[PDB]
Amino acid sequence: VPQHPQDLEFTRLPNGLVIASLENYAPASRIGLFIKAGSRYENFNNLGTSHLLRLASSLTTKGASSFKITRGIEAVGGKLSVTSTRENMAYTVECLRDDVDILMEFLLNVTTAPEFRRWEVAALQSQLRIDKAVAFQNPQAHVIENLHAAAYRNALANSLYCPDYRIGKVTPDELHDYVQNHFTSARMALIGLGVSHPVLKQVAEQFLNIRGGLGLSGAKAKYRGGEIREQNGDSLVHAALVAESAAIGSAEANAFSVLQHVLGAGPHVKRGSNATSSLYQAVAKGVHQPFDVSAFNASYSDSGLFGFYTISQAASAGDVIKAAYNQVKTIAQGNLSNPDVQAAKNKLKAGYLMSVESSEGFLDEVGCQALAAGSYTPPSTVLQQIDAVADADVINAAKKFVSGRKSMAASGNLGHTPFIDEL
Amino acid sequence: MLSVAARSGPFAPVLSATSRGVAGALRPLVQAAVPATSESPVLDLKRSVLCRESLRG
Amino acid sequence: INIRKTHPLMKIVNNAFIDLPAPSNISSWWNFGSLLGICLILQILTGLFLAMHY
Amino acid sequence: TATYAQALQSVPETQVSQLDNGLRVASEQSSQPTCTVGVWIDAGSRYETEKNNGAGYFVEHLAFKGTKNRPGNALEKEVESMGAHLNAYSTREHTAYYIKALSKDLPKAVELLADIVQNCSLEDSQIEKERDVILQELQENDTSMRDVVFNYLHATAFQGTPLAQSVEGPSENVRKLSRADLTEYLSRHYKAPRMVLAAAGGLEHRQLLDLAQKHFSGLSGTYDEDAVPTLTPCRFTGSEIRHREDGLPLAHVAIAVEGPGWANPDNVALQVANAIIGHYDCTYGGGMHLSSPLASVAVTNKLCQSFQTFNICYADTGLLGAHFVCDHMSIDDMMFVLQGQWMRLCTSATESEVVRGKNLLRNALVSHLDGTTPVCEDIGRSLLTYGRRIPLAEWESRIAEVDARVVREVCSKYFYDQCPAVAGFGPIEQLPDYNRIRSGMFWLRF
Amino acid sequence: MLTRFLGPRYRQLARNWVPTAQLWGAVGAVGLVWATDWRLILDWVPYINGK
Amino acid sequence: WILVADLLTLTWIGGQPVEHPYIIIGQLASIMYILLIMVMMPVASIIENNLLKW
Amino acid sequence: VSASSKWLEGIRKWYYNAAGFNKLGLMRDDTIHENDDVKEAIRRLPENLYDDRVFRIKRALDLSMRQQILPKEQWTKYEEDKFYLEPYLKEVIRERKEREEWAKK
Amino acid sequence: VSASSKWLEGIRKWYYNAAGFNKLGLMRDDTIHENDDVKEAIRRLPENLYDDRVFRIKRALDLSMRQQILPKEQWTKYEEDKFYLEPYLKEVIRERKEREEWAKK
Amino acid sequence: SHTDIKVPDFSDYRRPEVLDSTKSSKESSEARKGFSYLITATTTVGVAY
Ligand code: HEM
């Protein structure tokens, strides 16, 4: 038995830096840094410089040689990647606890020590084009990701890639500026897992001072709702039709998560009729062929939308998508069971469970705690807050979704598809 | 008390040099695997995927 | 890289004998050729040595 | 702290047990509030015999197909309404089936597991229809062509020879699918004594035995009769073929040299060796600084579009080696790389890398041990093959014992002067002859 | 610039090549023998004694 | 040009049959060849380098 | 290029009035014999610079063929010469000292 | 490839039982010595055809090396041979007759 | 749709040692390449003379 198992220490640096040492007695090493540098903080002054930087960790560093850095990184042979999110960019090192300091040093370097070398940068450029290649690549990178690119619409769609028209144009001015403009203690979140809150505090102190963030959530990112319309010639059509949800942290946010579960998503047990949803069960009763619809969460603190990602062959798109809306209408009827509600709470709440879970999808989930939670409203309290599940707002919500301007998204030719004005 | 993550099958890229890239982000879209003629490819001007390193005690 | 690929004089060489792609169907019609040169070489060779005394 | 080994001890201890069939039940009881409830469905990819072709893939398509104790949508009701998890991951001799659940739910799916264990039905409706969904869904469902790549490495570069035998079996068989394959050869195959009672999560092993008796009991009791031969060693194919494609736009190339399988004691360092090998990722950056010297020149020369050390498994043998991607060029120097690197390997050892890939297997070592399902299945094949579990300090022991003398030598022992797998995909002309490429299998570097 | 290949690394490299080095060396030497059959060494050769 | 001096120097040196002065003469000329090239020329090179300062 | 360096770098100034370089108005850095390090060194050179050294070089060839030289006035200003590469170059000296370094490692 | 043409094209049938081609199962058209006209002629060839002539050709090489031949049964069916190119080819004969024609013009 | 291929029988060409699916060339190879290597060296040592 550990001396009573260490409770992860949540804190904020007195400086206004997010100071998080989650004491983990676990054997391995998990090192997060959550950055407001995620796409939200991004700006139209630049393009893909986060796609870039996302590549550019390897770049020539101030006081650290990307080859020498590569020698230490390459040396321990551990896990260091900053993570690309709309909210954050996260410097991650999972490794043997020993090199942590070096890692930390590397970390300290990685974060704080860009040289942004012209020569180096220029070189780096092409690897991006490679990157965008990966980005758009395959029905995951294409029909999911490029049809994320063909799905994701707003400044969240400000890409994990860059713009084509922007191609090759990055500036080192835009580097030192960009971080100087973007990178900041405003973006500063440090999260230890496995280490000494004291030691993390040690390097943290002697190292990490910064500041300097900026303004706003979007145009209301211009709410076109409506189509991002894409002629594809996709063979089997890839169309995805966008309902909406609610903002991050919104009171109803959780409720939106319900509605998600209500229509549900991919099953925990494979190979099934998708028997579980009016979007699915009534895609089951409704639909006879390949189809998918699901709700996103594009969660600003400010706003949000949960669409339906959709999949089907062209012929039924009017048929299906209309039926989609139809089922949506049908759904918005407010007809629901109680076992719908509870067994939902089982399904989705379990969502929070595996969603919270284990050593990697700990570091990615309990590391979406060790980064992305911020406290435990425990599976006690957050699943109390989850137990705070309440159905009616899903009815009035059914209206609410029915009530807005939402988006449609097009991959294909609409010759069989609806255009949503003709809806 | 600060939250980023988990809704399964959307995209918020994760990439590195040591590693490779990916985005599994919040929201779905992964459900398509069902039909007959389940086919699937390789061999022409492409990328693929899937690596990792995992071992033991 | 591969010096076989790399070395310029070799670059000829591989291009000449070694790396040389050649019809697989190839037939015994061949042999004589190298023979002759071998012959020729020996020819010279001997003649030479022959010359040496003669 | 208590160092990686005394952390390895400090990493808590899993436990295992043997239920009375001789039935096998092992426990990792954890803080996992959910859990991976392995009912480890032990019917794998290679476990099957010649005319038995496809019956396990069909069985896979049959695995969730619905049953009596729980009907199909009912299986979806207890199960799906429960919002639970099921997979079938099929391997040479064994496989698994996950259940993700509230540890609270622990009994329920166990119950489900049992009928899974038993009540899976061949329904002349399903057997017509779900098996029109098998005849169809399967029938055309085949064609995955990375399984014509990676399983060209398996369905080709792994031969189909009785031991090399492929997985899916014939489309002629697809027509020829039988209840005799299911009515009979499900039973005529499926044999519980080998099935795995697999415990991952927060859990009570005492309760494990309990519910075992409660439901899981009464399984292997009916078992045996005839037909249980062993593996008669022989040679896998030993060849190459280009599916000859102008249509293959760019090589998806590859190669491999022994990958793990179940058995041999050597693969330990071979693991480490494969580490020294390593996988050169296209998406990977940093080639200028790349560790695998191969990888390096590959960057400098821009010498290929991918290579990934890929370990192909059979008890005591296999092939572990690079995937690859390339244009009209690379392959030649690639082997000059690869085999030469191997040659380089077979000679050139420096402890540095040895320690490096040691740390590789350490980190990675977590990454298997780390993770709930990875640990889960890890238990599954762990006893399946092993019957033991290399303890954290056992695997860290032979691991700890790692010896670079055995690198030079043992390298020579397994590696030297052989003919392991190489498979590109596409216009392979840079594939030299066995009289060249596999002349390249030999070293004039000395 | 011997320091270039002078390091415990390349040192170890030598430690590797050494036995082989003996081998190829022997190859050369014996070659000189049989090729030459030079009387100087030839004498010691028993039953390779040619008279 | 100095080395050259050593050279055609060596000529006229040979330009005499074996002679008292010559003995020493060429005797030094060799040193030159060894110096004026192997030493004095290389030594020179190093020197010029030092001067270079750039 | 001044008296110590008009004697010494006045092998490059007074005695490259004699050995030509600076009185030919050459670029000090440009005098480095081309090597690999030199090569990629230049590959990393600055652009406006690149043009500059270009015009310098070509011109040098020009009078060279002409076997003439610029006005002794036009002959280059002594001292007063940016060391063009030397920050960049010398940086690379550290580079190949670095590749050379971990190389040593 | 039948008796007149098993004597005559039975230099290609009975006497390419003797001269080998058709008893080797060759492709009549394929026998044309490669020429430029032949060249681009094939360049225009039909696809499924192209495969066919390919397998034919390779196989021919195969037994050739093997210095064997297929079963005399497997030896090609007489007559009963599409003239593969000859529409395409002969078309080209008109082509080079056309380039050749206005050429004459 | 793509997986259906198969391969032929080497027996007619097969040397004896490989006849069985029963046993490992773990024994055989060194003997086979041995015999050949022998022959080769015969050609090297003789040719040397
Ligand atoms: C440059 C290399 C060759 C040299 C140095 C060479 C020199 C000689 C000499 C000196 C003789 C007279 C001595 C004797 O008859 O044994 C001779 C004879 C001859 N060699 Fe060559 N020759 C050379 C290449 C050839 C070639 C290319 C041929 C044509 C195959 C050739 C065919 C002859 C013939 C026909 C004779 C006279 C017949 C005889 O051997 O009695 N030799 N050669």
JSON list of C-alpha atoms in Angstrom, two decimals, chain D residues 282-364:
[
{"chain": "D", "resi": 282, "resn": "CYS", "atom": "CA", "xyz": [7.26, 7.90, -43.49]},
{"chain": "D", "resi": 283, "resn": "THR", "atom": "CA", "xyz": [5.28, 10.21, -41.26]},
{"chain": "D", "resi": 284, "resn": "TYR", "atom": "CA", "xyz": [8.31, 10.24, -39.00]},
{"chain": "D", "resi": 285, "resn": "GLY", "atom": "CA", "xyz": [10.44, 13.34, -39.32]},
{"chain": "D", "resi": 286, "resn": "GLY", "atom": "CA", "xyz": [13.99, 14.04, -38.23]},
{"chain": "D", "resi": 287, "resn": "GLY", "atom": "CA", "xyz": [15.76, 11.87, -40.77]},
{"chain": "D", "resi": 288, "resn": "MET", "atom": "CA", "xyz": [18.83, 14.09, -40.83]},
{"chain": "D", "resi": 289, "resn": "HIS", "atom": "CA", "xyz": [19.21, 13.07, -37.19]},
{"chain": "D", "resi": 290, "resn": "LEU", "atom": "CA", "xyz": [17.58, 9.66, -37.62]},
{"chain": "D", "resi": 291, "resn": "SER", "atom": "CA", "xyz": [18.84, 6.85, -35.40]},
{"chain": "D", "resi": 292, "resn": "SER", "atom": "CA", "xyz": [18.67, 3.87, -37.71]},
{"chain": "D", "resi": 293, "resn": "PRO", "atom": "CA", "xyz": [21.65, 4.60, -39.95]},
{"chain": "D", "resi": 294, "resn": "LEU", "atom": "CA", "xyz": [19.54, 3.03, -42.65]},
{"chain": "D", "resi": 295, "resn": "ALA", "atom": "CA", "xyz": [16.89, 5.58, -41.85]},
{"chain": "D", "resi": 296, "resn": "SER", "atom": "CA", "xyz": [19.55, 8.28, -42.00]},
{"chain": "D", "resi": 297, "resn": "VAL", "atom": "CA", "xyz": [20.82, 7.62, -45.51]},
{"chain": "D", "resi": 298, "resn": "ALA", "atom": "CA", "xyz": [17.24, 6.96, -46.51]},
{"chain": "D", "resi": 299, "resn": "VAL", "atom": "CA", "xyz": [16.71, 10.58, -45.59]},
{"chain": "D", "resi": 300, "resn": "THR", "atom": "CA", "xyz": [19.93, 11.87, -47.10]},
{"chain": "D", "resi": 301, "resn": "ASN", "atom": "CA", "xyz": [19.53, 9.77, -50.18]},
{"chain": "D", "resi": 302, "resn": "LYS", "atom": "CA", "xyz": [15.80, 10.34, -49.98]},
{"chain": "D", "resi": 303, "resn": "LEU", "atom": "CA", "xyz": [16.20, 6.67, -50.39]},
{"chain": "D", "resi": 304, "resn": "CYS", "atom": "CA", "xyz": [12.71, 5.28, -49.79]},
{"chain": "D", "resi": 305, "resn": "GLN", "atom": "CA", "xyz": [9.20, 6.26, -48.84]},
{"chain": "D", "resi": 306, "resn": "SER", "atom": "CA", "xyz": [8.91, 3.92, -45.85]},
{"chain": "D", "resi": 307, "resn": "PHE", "atom": "CA", "xyz": [10.34, 1.00, -43.92]},
{"chain": "D", "resi": 308, "resn": "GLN", "atom": "CA", "xyz": [8.97, -0.46, -40.73]},
{"chain": "D", "resi": 309, "resn": "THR", "atom": "CA", "xyz": [10.41, -3.37, -38.79]},
{"chain": "D", "resi": 310, "resn": "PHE", "atom": "CA", "xyz": [7.47, -5.77, -38.64]},
{"chain": "D", "resi": 311, "resn": "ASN", "atom": "CA", "xyz": [7.64, -8.98, -36.61]},
{"chain": "D", "resi": 312, "resn": "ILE", "atom": "CA", "xyz": [5.82, -11.95, -38.17]},
{"chain": "D", "resi": 313, "resn": "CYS", "atom": "CA", "xyz": [5.02, -14.62, -35.68]},
{"chain": "D", "resi": 314, "resn": "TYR", "atom": "CA", "xyz": [5.10, -18.37, -35.36]},
{"chain": "D", "resi": 315, "resn": "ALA", "atom": "CA", "xyz": [6.12, -20.35, -32.33]},
{"chain": "D", "resi": 316, "resn": "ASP", "atom": "CA", "xyz": [9.94, -20.29, -32.54]},
{"chain": "D", "resi": 317, "resn": "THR", "atom": "CA", "xyz": [10.17, -18.51, -35.94]},
{"chain": "D", "resi": 318, "resn": "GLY", "atom": "CA", "xyz": [8.83, -15.79, -38.21]},
{"chain": "D", "resi": 319, "resn": "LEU", "atom": "CA", "xyz": [9.97, -12.59, -39.89]},
{"chain": "D", "resi": 320, "resn": "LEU", "atom": "CA", "xyz": [10.38, -9.14, -38.26]},
{"chain": "D", "resi": 321, "resn": "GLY", "atom": "CA", "xyz": [11.17, -6.41, -40.68]},
{"chain": "D", "resi": 322, "resn": "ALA", "atom": "CA", "xyz": [10.50, -3.30, -42.61]},
{"chain": "D", "resi": 323, "resn": "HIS", "atom": "CA", "xyz": [7.49, -2.36, -44.55]},
{"chain": "D", "resi": 324, "resn": "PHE", "atom": "CA", "xyz": [8.61, 0.03, -47.19]},
{"chain": "D", "resi": 325, "resn": "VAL", "atom": "CA", "xyz": [7.52, 2.38, -49.91]},
{"chain": "D", "resi": 326, "resn": "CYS", "atom": "CA", "xyz": [9.53, 3.45, -52.91]},
{"chain": "D", "resi": 327, "resn": "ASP", "atom": "CA", "xyz": [9.57, 4.29, -56.59]},
{"chain": "D", "resi": 328, "resn": "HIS", "atom": "CA", "xyz": [11.34, 2.52, -59.41]},
{"chain": "D", "resi": 329, "resn": "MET", "atom": "CA", "xyz": [14.53, 2.65, -57.37]},
{"chain": "D", "resi": 330, "resn": "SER", "atom": "CA", "xyz": [15.13, 1.91, -53.77]},
{"chain": "D", "resi": 331, "resn": "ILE", "atom": "CA", "xyz": [14.90, -1.78, -53.15]},
{"chain": "D", "resi": 332, "resn": "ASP", "atom": "CA", "xyz": [18.41, -2.67, -54.20]},
{"chain": "D", "resi": 333, "resn": "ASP", "atom": "CA", "xyz": [20.29, -0.39, -51.86]},
{"chain": "D", "resi": 334, "resn": "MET", "atom": "CA", "xyz": [17.48, -1.06, -49.41]},
{"chain": "D", "resi": 335, "resn": "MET", "atom": "CA", "xyz": [18.75, -4.57, -48.92]},
{"chain": "D", "resi": 336, "resn": "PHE", "atom": "CA", "xyz": [22.21, -3.14, -49.18]},
{"chain": "D", "resi": 337, "resn": "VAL", "atom": "CA", "xyz": [20.75, -1.16, -46.39]},
{"chain": "D", "resi": 338, "resn": "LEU", "atom": "CA", "xyz": [18.68, -3.92, -44.92]},
{"chain": "D", "resi": 339, "resn": "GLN", "atom": "CA", "xyz": [20.71, -7.07, -45.28]},
{"chain": "D", "resi": 340, "resn": "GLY", "atom": "CA", "xyz": [23.81, -4.94, -45.22]},
{"chain": "D", "resi": 341, "resn": "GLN", "atom": "CA", "xyz": [22.55, -3.26, -42.10]},
{"chain": "D", "resi": 342, "resn": "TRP", "atom": "CA", "xyz": [21.87, -6.82, -41.02]},
{"chain": "D", "resi": 343, "resn": "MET", "atom": "CA", "xyz": [25.40, -7.52, -42.17]},
{"chain": "D", "resi": 344, "resn": "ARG", "atom": "CA", "xyz": [26.31, -4.33, -40.37]},
{"chain": "D", "resi": 345, "resn": "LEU", "atom": "CA", "xyz": [24.28, -5.69, -37.51]},
{"chain": "D", "resi": 346, "resn": "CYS", "atom": "CA", "xyz": [25.78, -9.16, -37.72]},
{"chain": "D", "resi": 347, "resn": "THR", "atom": "CA", "xyz": [29.12, -7.47, -37.32]},
{"chain": "D", "resi": 348, "resn": "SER", "atom": "CA", "xyz": [29.01, -3.96, -36.12]},
{"chain": "D", "resi": 349, "resn": "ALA", "atom": "CA", "xyz": [27.58, -4.08, -32.58]},
{"chain": "D", "resi": 350, "resn": "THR", "atom": "CA", "xyz": [28.23, -1.15, -30.25]},
{"chain": "D", "resi": 351, "resn": "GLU", "atom": "CA", "xyz": [26.77, -1.26, -26.78]},
{"chain": "D", "resi": 352, "resn": "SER", "atom": "CA", "xyz": [25.28, 2.19, -27.22]},
{"chain": "D", "resi": 353, "resn": "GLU", "atom": "CA", "xyz": [22.37, 1.12, -29.37]},
{"chain": "D", "resi": 354, "resn": "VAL", "atom": "CA", "xyz": [22.09, -2.01, -27.25]},
{"chain": "D", "resi": 355, "resn": "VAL", "atom": "CA", "xyz": [21.34, 0.23, -24.31]},
{"chain": "D", "resi": 356, "resn": "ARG", "atom": "CA", "xyz": [19.14, 2.42, -26.48]},
{"chain": "D", "resi": 357, "resn": "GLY", "atom": "CA", "xyz": [16.77, -0.26, -27.69]},
{"chain": "D", "resi": 358, "resn": "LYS", "atom": "CA", "xyz": [17.04, -1.56, -24.21]},
{"chain": "D", "resi": 359, "resn": "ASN", "atom": "CA", "xyz": [15.34, 1.68, -23.20]},
{"chain": "D", "resi": 360, "resn": "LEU", "atom": "CA", "xyz": [13.07, 1.17, -26.17]},
{"chain": "D", "resi": 361, "resn": "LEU", "atom": "CA", "xyz": [11.94, -2.16, -24.83]},
{"chain": "D", "resi": 362, "resn": "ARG", "atom": "CA", "xyz": [11.69, -0.43, -21.48]},
{"chain": "D", "resi": 363, "resn": "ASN", "atom": "CA", "xyz": [9.38, 2.36, -22.56]},
{"chain": "D", "resi": 364, "resn": "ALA", "atom": "CA", "xyz": [7.50, 0.10, -24.91]}
]
